[PDB]
Design a binder for this molecule. Structure first.
Ligand SMILES: CCCCCCCCCCCCCCCCCC(=O)OC[C@H](COP(=O)([O-])OCC(O)COP(=O)([O-])OC[C@@H](COC(=O)CCCCCCCCCCCCCCCCC)OC(=O)CCCCCCCCCCCCCCCCC)OC(=O)CCCCCCCCCCCCCCCCC
Ligand SMILES: CCCCCCCCCCCCCCCCCC(=O)OC[C@H](COP(=O)([O-])OCC[N+](C)(C)C)OC(=O)CCCCCCCCCCCCCCCCC
Ligand SMILES: CCCCCCCCCCCCCCCCCC(=O)OC[C@H](COP(=O)([O-])OCC[N+](C)(C)C)OC(=O)CCCCCCCCCCCCCCCCC
Ligand SMILES: CCCCCCCCCCCCCCCCCC(=O)OC[C@H](COP(=O)([O-])OCC[N+](C)(C)C)OC(=O)CCCCCCCCCCCCCCCCC
Ligand SMILES: CCCCCCCCCCCCCCCCCC(=O)OC[C@H](COP(=O)([O-])OCC[N+](C)(C)C)OC(=O)CCCCCCCCCCCCCCCCC
Ligand SMILES: CCCCCCCCCCCCCCCCCC(=O)OC[C@H](COP(=O)([O-])OCC[N+](C)(C)C)OC(=O)CCCCCCCCCCCCCCCCC
Ligand SMILES: COC1=C(OC)C(=O)C(C/C=C(\C)CC/C=C(\C)CC/C=C(\C)CC/C=C(/C)CC/C=C(/C)CC/C=C(\C)CC/C=C(\C)CCC=C(C)C)=C(C)C1=O
Ligand SMILES: CCCCCCCCCCCCCCCCCC(=O)OC[C@H](COP(=O)(O)OCCN)OC(=O)CCCCCCCCCCCCCCCCC
Ligand SMILES: CCCCCCCCCCCCCCCCCC(=O)OC[C@H](COP(=O)(O)OCCN)OC(=O)CCCCCCCCCCCCCCCCC
Ligand SMILES: CCCCCCCCCCCCCCCCCC(=O)OC[C@H](COP(=O)(O)OCCN)OC(=O)CCCCCCCCCCCCCCCCC
Ligand SMILES: Nc1ncnc2c1ncn2[C@@H]1O[C@H](COP(=O)(O)OP(=O)(O)OP(=O)(O)O)[C@@H](O)[C@H]1O
Ligand code: CUA
Lengths: 62, 110, 251, 49, 130, 98, 51, 104, 78, 52, 125, 50, 222
């Protein structure tokens, strides 16, 4: 437990302002990031048209 | 001392050179890397990072830490495997990294 | 020699490409992976085409500075040169870089100034090498980024040479027939001069080197504006072409 | 001749150079924090190089 | 070796950042990175006004008399208008953007005046000495 | 230090070189105890200068681009304020219609 | 000289005794090592002076 | 070089298990050590193990260029002695093996 | 990296060019780039403030900006 | 030839059992036999026993 | 088309037309043989496609490249023996009739013996 | 340790050729894409690839 | 309490703050006493660092030249050539001012560890070129038929030997690559495959890797 470290994984934004909406959105357990952290650093495979269609059809979880 | 050093150099560099001299059907790369590991991973040019503070000052130590991480980022490197880790703080004083392993990128030390 | 046989059966290599974890790379039109290929020879008494040279290199030739007899004015012609060249002259000027970093029109004879400074320049006992670069002038300085590793592959055309930069303390022996690889890392923004450090012959003394390590933004600007256009100048060369390339590849 | 001059000349010279010449600093520079440092004398001129 | 240098100046600390709105800028940049918008112009806090078309059409450059031959998704990232997902994940970062813009406006409003007397010897107050 | 640690000092002198320079070797300590102070202090100063240079290099490498981006954003914000004022003036002009 | 950014790294004078430049990390390390090389000769120099 | 310990002996039994798993000339031992470090303090937790696996995915992606879905579509996750870290799939497999070998 | 100091140039031609670029950018941004052709140069917008503080102050001045807008409208109409 | 069925990834209990087995083997390794930790260590030890 | 498109089309056509210009150059001292006919070429391609169709399920199901490599090596040894037979027969063939006879023999030998051997080895695997 | 044994890890490759009596520097075509794919450091030490 | 839809973008929301009051954000940031001095220093540094171009009173435009030494810039400012119009750091006017690092490495088919001890890399270059030519002897004539060199570039597939080609190019200098390309041309013209000439495997010593069951030789574990 003492030696446990994050090693730079999933080091997303950590809000400091009290009224920043992220400070509540990240607290919300049912929050989906735009892309998974491992995939955030991997090359895209879908074509431009497919990506645009997926983004257009995407719906916010709330 | 010179004779022992020369014997070690021979064992690592001269005799293994003759093991493979033609293309190999099976496991050619494996055998080539087997014969090359003993020569390319000699401690003379690998050991020393464990006591890098002898020559690297704190700020210089952090800069050289990031530089070495970038240089040895390549996974396929037995020399990097045998080299001492760069994920550590200067023993005298650290100014950049407060805790080891608490980064924003798995590769960049900062 | 021996003639190309009428038919050859060639095994398709397997496992060369690990993309998407697909051992088989060739699939038949009917939807079946192909393990073998049949290659047929027609017109056996025929020549074989030479391998097409598909290697593109941006090449900079660094040579010693050449004296200028006359300082020609900057002249720009009209665009849309559908012919060999446009005789009409759009702009003609004599810009000079002032101490204010402005290209102002010169009110002096540039050739006269050049001749006077060539003949009777003022020197001193303790003059910095920066202001005294007599035997350290070249053209097309090599521009690199700073704070990043670069792989330098050293070689020679005729005999052994030495690429020497004392400012960086880097000495690389360029030997014919060898492809020695070196790691190059400049941890600061700076301009470095150098000379050759291996007897080569007539102009061993006069063979300088100029290497400028710049912040990545300036390096990328220089690349896009001077080098990247040249890499396609061999086939396509125009202002619109350069604009298209720089818009298509934006960093 | 042997000891005191040899072991104090370079340090005295560097101290005086820092005093009276700003260790050869080239002025007209901006934001010393970002600017490089012009080091004091470090090569022993009195010692045989 | 062990103590060949014979001394280490541990006292000399890492020089502290003193820029006015560095923290706000870094927070906004981190929020934008989390949003993961392919366009880079969003790095500027005033992107919706500097490039208004980024929300409607996405055409930020006039491609007149110049060919437009995209090859993949990384060719003309600045020519693609923001989608609903990008707009949502950027709206989630408005609070940081407002603070950053307010800090920038305050810095702009602040001006030099003859009242200041330590302007010449401001390096000590800036902590340039070690 | 040296011969005193040995209970056979004659053997200590003989087995090394069969030569006797002990007088000078033991009188040199007094001079050596103070000949090093100027060099040591100048070296401390030089090491501090090197440390400051390294810290400045690290700070530049890490923050110079950040400062440039901050300045760029500040100028863009100035332009944004000017643009807001220009939009207000244009709206007023459209409403009035000279 | 890249604009107002002076990229020149060597400003040695006609009678330079040290390295051409000290901006490079390698040269900085070499200069520091050379300076501290002569620091560890006090006892030997005193002994030779007495001899 | 990129591990959490100055020498492999400082690391616990996981480093020895990695050495046994991979041949002495195979540099996948370093990736196995990275997996061990990721799994330190997480294997004994149902969420910690998944977090360590995701850390392995991220580490492989940062080490080598990779596409989306390759690591998910890897056919066999097992590792043999002569497997080298020449591909993201191999790096990920070695990291997973290290995480599995990790005890605490 | 040593950067040498140099105050704003305040060159007449340079500031005129920068002011023309700024005016074009303002005209396009007022309509939100609803124009046949775009001529905005944000880099030159930055350089305008970096190099010509006097014109920036005039633009910030409510009266100066009003006069500039009136003159621009008159020129466009004529 | 034919390929055997590949088992699903082991669970934490299976990992613990494997760790215990490896520890038992390491302890069983004789002290006076100097064999390096590697994939072929057990094969090398068997070869050495046959050679002895 | 734009200038870039025209250049790309020109490059593609020139790269494809290498044989067009290479045909004009021929060597006098050359053991010229009778090329295999187009019908026989298509028949042999169809036989190869049939072999690939028979082999596709087992190789696709297999997950280790070693077994696929062994199967490929064995099938290649058989096909290479048959290829040597075909080459020696066709090269000495003195007419298109003999060339067609040799090609028909080769393709029939494939379709029967190679098919049986492939089925046997696949069942073994 | 810093100035050697890092050829495998470099941003791009430059070929330096020496001739009688000038230098030649060659940038391979892959250097263009290597430079285009350079990671950017933004935010609190975060890295992004565009 | 929150409205249960906190963070949702309102329909038709526009990213405009034309009439926003910034006084409410004053307490969310802290400015040091030398904010004005810092602003002026930032402006000075940006102007003197990012400005690699110079305005010309003749063309009424910004022009630039390749990096030059201080001697050339100072003592030959009146004699300059190759001036080119300044195009801007980025097409859209954004900032390229970032700290760059090292990009993730490319997967390797022929490892450099085969001859990594040698810094010359001549053996590695030879091996990589041999492997590339082995792949070429298979795919060279199909390159123009069903690969990148097809006329219909829309349905194009990357040449299978691309990675081997790039690795060989990296390992080989241009002159050695030209030598090897001449050898490759001769070998392709002869239509010679190394398989039909190789008989040294008979004289090579046996090893565990030569076992008749290569597939069963390997042992897999989790
Ligand atoms: C060109 C010209 C210019 C130069 C150009 C440059 C040229 C470059 C050339 C480069 C050449 C490279 C090679 C260099 C080497 C060459 C060597 C060579 O050729 O000659 C061979 C030469 C031959 O040997 P040597 O040097 O002659 O040996 C003699 C000894 O070194 C000497 O020691 P010794 O034991 O024989 O005699 C001394 C001893 C003998 O004296 C004694 O009798 C001992 C007494 C001990 C007790 C003292 C206290 C008693 C108190 C009593 C009560 C008092 C009253 C009460 C008061 C109470 C309150 C105050 O007394 C002492 O001084 C020792 C005292 C202990 C010190 C530490 C004490 C710490 C606590 C404080 C105690 C005292 C103060 C407090 C007092 C009370 C406070 C309350 O050297 C060698 O053998 C080889 C040397 C190789 C180098 C490494 C050597 C390591 C081994 C140790 C020796 C180190 C020193 C010598 C090094 C050599 C240089 C000096
Ligand atoms: C009588 C007392 C005996 C004492 C026992 C020790 C001495 C035994 C006899 C001499 C041989 C000593 C060999 C030691 C090293 C063996 C292994 C080896 O070479 O590799 C390790 C190392 C090499 O390590 P490496 O770099 O190859 O590392 C291998 C591991 N990887 C690949 C992962 C990095 O050997 C050397 O570096 C040799 C350097 C030359 C000098 C060696 C001096 C040894 C110590 C002094 C011995 C003095 C003997 C005097 C005898 C007469 C007087 C009594
Ligand atoms: C057995 C033989 C062994 C021989 C070993 C080899 C010895 C080699 C060294 C020999 C040194 C000889 C003495 C040199 C004195 C130089 C003093 C000098 O200029 O200052 C240097 C140093 C240089 O420091 P600086 O501050 O002047 O300048 C540094 C350089 N700048 C400024 C450019 C960065 O200054 C001092 O040391 C200042 C104090 C000097 C005090 C002593 C003055 C003595 C004057 C000469 C002797 C007296 C005159 C009559 C002599 C009659 C003799 C018969
Ligand atoms: C720079 C500051 C000093 C740093 C400390 C460095 C010294 C570290 C200790 C080294 C001990 C091992 C030395 C090996 C070589 C011994 C050779 C020899 O003749 O020994 C047999 C001797 C035998 O001497 P003997 O006189 O009893 O018998 C020999 C005579 N016949 C043959 C007639 C019998 O044993 C010793 O006395 C051992 C002495 C060890 C100390 C070193 C002696 C040399 C002078 C330096 C003294 C240093 C003191 C250090 C104190 C501790 C500080 C941490
Ligand atoms: C069995 C072999 C030994 C074990 C392996 C040791 C390897 C690691 C250390 C090797 C390098 C040692 C030198 C470091 C740099 C200092 C050099 C120096 O001062 O030399 C000048 C000195 C002489 O020059 P000097 O007289 O100018 O010394 C400086 C004088 N003042 C203080 C006035 C400035 O060297 C010597 O002759 C003395 C020996 C060196 C100094 C030793 C100090 C004690 C430390 C313990 C030594 C015993 C070994 C253990 C080492 C600790 C770590 C394990
Ligand atoms: C010219 C006459 C030549 C006559 C002999 C020629 C025939 C072949 C002889 C082969 C002898 C092999 C002996 C192996 C001994 C292994 C011992 C051991 O346990 O090692 C374990 C080590 C490490 O392996 P390990 O320790 O992991 O293995 C476990 C070992 N046991 C079971 C004991 C625990 O083995 C090796 O390192 C492999 C063998 C190394 C051999 C080194 C040879 C050095 C040669 C120097 C240069 C000589 C040039 C001569 C030029 C002549 C010119 C005319
Ligand atoms: C710790 O302190 C120390 C140092 O730190 C400074 C050290 O560096 C060092 C290292 C130093 C060394 C190893 C020694 C270095 C060398 C030294 C000191 C010697 C240097 C000497 C010189 C530069 C002087 C050269 C000598 C000369 C005679 C030159 C000529 C000068 C003069 C005045 C005479 C001119 C005459 C002529 C040219 C000839 C004219 C006459 C004739 C032809 C005769 C005609 C005949 C008739 C009959 C009329 C040490 C040892 C040290 O202890
Ligand atoms: C002290 C006791 C311990 C043992 C001491 C051993 C000392 C060995 C001394 C050998 C001297 C050989 C003759 C003198 C040669 C001097 C010049 C030289 O070495 O030239 C270099 C040359 C290498 O040729 P090159 O074309 O450069 O190819 C190498 C590529 N890396 O070099 C060569 O051509 C190398 C030739 C090597 C021949 C080796 C033959 C024996 C092999 C035995 C295998 C191991 C088992 C048996 C060991 C028995 C030991 C007695
Ligand atoms: C012609 C020759 C005649 C004989 C020789 C006489 C002396 C001549 C002059 C010698 C040269 C002096 C000048 C050059 C060396 C000193 C340089 C110096 O002091 O630099 C500063 C340095 C510490 O500064 P730093 O913090 O690193 O940098 C920031 C500065 N604010 O300073 C330091 O390191 C701090 C120093 C603190 C004060 C030290 C006082 C020493 C007193 C000694 C008493 C007697 C001996 C005691 C010995 C005890 C140990 C055995
Ligand atoms: C006084 C001045 C003169 C002294 C004589 C001259 C020679 C001096 C030699 C150096 C002395 C300094 C001490 C030794 C070096 C210490 C630093 C070091 O090298 O440490 C790293 C490494 C051990 O690292 P690592 O294996 O990871 O540690 C885990 C241990 N369980 O280090 C190693 O490789 C460790 C090697 C251990 C060897 C042990 C030899 C037998 C002694 C065992 C311990 C003592 C037994 C006696 C009783 C102790 C308890 C009372
Ligand atoms: N085409 C390739 N691309 C990249 N790496 C390869 C390639 N071929 C082999 N390797 C490396 O060589 C090692 C051994 O290759 P081998 O042919 O034995 O693998 P395999 O049977 O396909 O399966 P595995 O990936 O499990 O080893 C591979 O693990 C990989 O490290
Ligand atoms: Cu070229 Cu010396």
């Amino acid at each position: 437990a003492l030696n446990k470290r994050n090693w730079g994984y999933n080091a997303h934004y950590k809000p400091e302002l009290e009224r920043s909406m992220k400070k509540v959105l990240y607290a919300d357990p049912n929050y989906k990031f735009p892309i998974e952290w491992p995939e955030r650093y991997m090359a895209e495979t879908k074509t431009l048209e497919q990506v645009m269609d997926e983004e257009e059809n995407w719906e916010y979880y709330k | 001392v010179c004779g022992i050093y020369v014997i070690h150099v021979i064992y690592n560099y001269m005799i293994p050179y003759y093991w493979v001299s033609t293309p190999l059907k099976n496991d050619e790369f494996t055998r080539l890397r087997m014969k090359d590991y003993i020569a390319s991973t000699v401690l003379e040019e690998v050991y020393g990072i464990s006591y890098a503070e002898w020559g690297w000052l704190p700020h210089d130590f952090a800069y050289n830490r990031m530089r070495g991480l970038a240089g040895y980022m390549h996974p396929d490197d037995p020399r990097a495997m045998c080299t001492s880790t760069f994920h550590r703080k200067h023993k005298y004083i650290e100014h950049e990294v407060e805790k080891v392993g608490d980064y924003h990128h798995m590769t960049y030390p900062k | 020699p021996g003639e190309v046989l009428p038919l050859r059966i060639i095994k398709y290599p397997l496992g060369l490409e690990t993309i998407h974890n697909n051992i088989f790379e060739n699939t038949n039109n009917e939807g079946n992976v192909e393990l073998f290929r049949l290659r047929f020879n027609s017109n056996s008494s025929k020549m074989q085409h030479k391998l097409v040279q598909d290697t593109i290199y941006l090449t900079l030739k660094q040579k010693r500075y050449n004296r200028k007899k006359v300082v020609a004015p900057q002249i720009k012609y009209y665009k849309d040169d559908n012919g060999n060249k446009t005789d009409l002259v759009k702009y003609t000027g004599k810009p000079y870089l002032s101490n204010d970093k402005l290209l102002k029109q010169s009110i002096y004879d540039q050739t006269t100034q050049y001749k006077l400074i060539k003949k009777n320049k003022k020197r001193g006992e303790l003059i910095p090498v920066t202001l005294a670069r007599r035997i350290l002038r070249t053209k097309k300085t090599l521009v690199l980024p700073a704070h990043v590793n670069i792989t330098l592959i050293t070689n020679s055309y005729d005999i052994v040479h030495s690429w020497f930069i004392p400012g960086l303390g880097i000495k690389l022996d360029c030997v014919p027939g060898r492809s020695t690889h070196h790691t190059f890392f400049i941890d600061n923004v700076g301009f470095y001069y150098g000379q050759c450090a291996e007897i080569c012959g007539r102009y061993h003394h006069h063979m300088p080197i100029r290497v400028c390590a710049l912040p990545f933004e300036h390096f990328l600007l220089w690349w896009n504006t001077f080098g990247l256009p040249k890499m396609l100048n061999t086939v396509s060369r125009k202002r619109f072409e350069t604009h298209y390339e720089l818009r298509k590849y934006s960093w | 001749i042997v000891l005191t001059w040899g072991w104090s000349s370079f340090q005295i010279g560097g101290y005086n150079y820092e005093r009276f010449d700003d260790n050869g600093e080239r002025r007209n520079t901006l934001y010393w924090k970002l600017s490089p440092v012009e080091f004091p004398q470090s090569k022993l001129w009195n010692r045989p190089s | 070796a062990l103590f060949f240098m014979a001394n280490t100046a541990i006292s000399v600390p890492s020089v502290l950042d003193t820029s006015p709105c560095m923290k706000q800028m870094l927070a906004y940049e981190d929020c934008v990175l989390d949003a993961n918008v392919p366009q880079q112009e969003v790095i500027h806090p005033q992107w919706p006004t500097i490039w208004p078309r980024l929300l409607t059409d996405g055409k930020l450059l006039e491609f007149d008399k110049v060919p437009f031959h995209p090859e993949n998704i990384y060719n003309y990232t600045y020519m693609r208008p923001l989608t609903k997902k990008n707009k949502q994940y950027l709206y989630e970062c408005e609070e940081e953007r407002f603070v950053f813009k307010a800090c920038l406006r305050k810095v702009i409003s602040l001006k030099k005046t003859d009242k200041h007397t330590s302007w010449d010897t401001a390096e000590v107050a800036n902590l340039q000495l070690t | 230090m040296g011969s005193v640690w040995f209970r056979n000092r004659y053997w200590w002198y003989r087995s090394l070189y069969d030569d006797y320079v002990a007088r000078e070797a033991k009188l040199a300590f007094g001079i050596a105890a103070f000949i090093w102070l100027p060099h040591y202090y100048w070296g401390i100063h030089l090491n501090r200068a090197f440390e400051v240079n390294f810290s400045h290099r690290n700070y530049a490498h890490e923050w110079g681009p950040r400062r440039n981006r901050l300045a760029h954003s500040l100028e863009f914000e100035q332009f944004d304020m000017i643009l807001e004022n220009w939009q207000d003036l244009e709206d007023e002009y459209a409403q009035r219609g000279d | 000289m890249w604009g107002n950014l002076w990229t020149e790294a060597s400003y040695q004078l006609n009678f330079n005794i040290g390295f051409s430049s000290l901006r490079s990390d390698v040269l900085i390390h070499l200069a520091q090592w050379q300076y501290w090389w002569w620091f560890w000769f006090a006892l030997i120099w005193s002994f030779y002076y007495f001899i | 070089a990129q591990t959490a310990h100055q020498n492999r002996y400082q690391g616990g039994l996981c480093y020895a298990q990695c050495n046994e798993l991979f041949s002495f000339w195979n540099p996948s031992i370093q990736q196995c050590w990275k997996g061990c470090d990721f799994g330190v303090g997480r294997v004994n937790d149902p969420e910690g193990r998944i977090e360590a696996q995701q850390m392995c995915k991220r580490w492989a992606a940062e080490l080598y260029w990779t596409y989306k879905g390759e690591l998910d579509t890897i056919k066999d996750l097992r590792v043999h002695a002569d497997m080298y870290p020449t591909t993201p799939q191999n790096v990920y497999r070695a990291c997973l093996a290290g995480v599995r070998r990790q005890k605490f | 990296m040593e950067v040498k100091y140099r105050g704003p140039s305040d060159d007449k031609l340079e500031c005129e060019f920068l002011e023309n670029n700024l005016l074009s950018c303002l005209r396009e941004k007022s309509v939100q780039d609803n124009v046949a052709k775009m001529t905005c140069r944000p880099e030159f917008l930055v350089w305008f403030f970096l190099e010509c503080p006097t014109k920036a102050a005039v633009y910030h001045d409510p009266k100066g900006l009003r006069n500039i807008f009136i003159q621009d409208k008159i020129k466009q109409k004529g | 030839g034919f390929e055997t069925v590949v088992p699903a990834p082991p669970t934490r209990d299976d990992e613990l059992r494997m760790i215990k087995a490896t520890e038992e083997q390491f302890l069983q390794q004789p002290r006076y036999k100097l064999y390096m930790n590697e994939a072929h260590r057990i094969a090398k030890m068997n070869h050495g026993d046959r050679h002895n | 088309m734009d200038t870039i498109q025209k250049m790309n089309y020109e490059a593609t056509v020139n790269m494809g037309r290498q044989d067009l210009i290479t045909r004009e150059y021929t060597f006098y001292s050359d053991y010229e043989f009778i090329p295999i006919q187009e019908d026989r070429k298509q028949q042999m391609e169809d036989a190869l496609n049939n072999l690939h169709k028979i082999i596709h399920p087992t190789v696709t199901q297999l997950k280790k490249k070693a077994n696929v490599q062994e199967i490929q090596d064995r099938v290649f040894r058989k096909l290479q023996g048959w290829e040597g037979e075909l080459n020696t027969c066709v090269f000495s063939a003195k007419n298109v009739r003999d060339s067609n006879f040799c090609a028909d023999r080769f393709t029939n030998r494939i379709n029967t013996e190679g098919v049986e051997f492939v089925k046997q080895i696949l069942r073994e695997y | 340790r810093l100035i050697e044994w890092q050829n495998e890890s470099s941003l791009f490759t430059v070929r330096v050729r020496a001739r009688q009596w000038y230098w030649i520097y060659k940038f391979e075509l892959k250097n263009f894409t290597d430079i285009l794919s350079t990671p950017k450091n933004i935010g609190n030490n975060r890295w992004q690839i565009n | 309490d929150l409205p249960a839809d906190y963070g949702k973008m309102p329909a038709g929301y526009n990213f405009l703050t034309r009439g926003k009051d910034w006084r409410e954000y004053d307490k969310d940031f802290i400015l040091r006493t030398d904010a004005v001095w810092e602003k002026f220093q930032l402006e000075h540094f940006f102007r003197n660092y990012m400005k690699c171009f110079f305005f010309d009173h003749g063309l009424k435009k910004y022009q630039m030249f390749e990096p030059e030494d201080m001697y050339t810039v100072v003592f030959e400012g009146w004699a300059l050539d190759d001036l080119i119009t300044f195009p801007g750091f980025t097409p859209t006017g954004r900032t390229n001012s970032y700290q760059i690092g090292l990009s993730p490495r490319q997967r390797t088919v022929v490892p450099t560890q085969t001859f990594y001890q040698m810094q010359d890399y001549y053996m590695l270059c030879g091996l990589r070129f041999e492997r590339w030519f082995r792949c070429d002897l298979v795919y060279h004539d199909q390159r123009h038929t069903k690969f990148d060199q097809v006329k219909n570039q829309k349905n194009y597939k990357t040449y299978p030997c691309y990675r081997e080609y790039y690795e060989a190019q990296y390992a080989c200098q241009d002159d050695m690559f030209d030598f090897l390309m001449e050898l490759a041309y001769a070998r392709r013209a002869a239509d010679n495959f190394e398989s039909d000439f190789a008989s040294h495997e008979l004289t090579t010593l046996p090893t565990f890797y030569d076992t008749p069951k290569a597939a069963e030789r390997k042992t897999y574990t989790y």
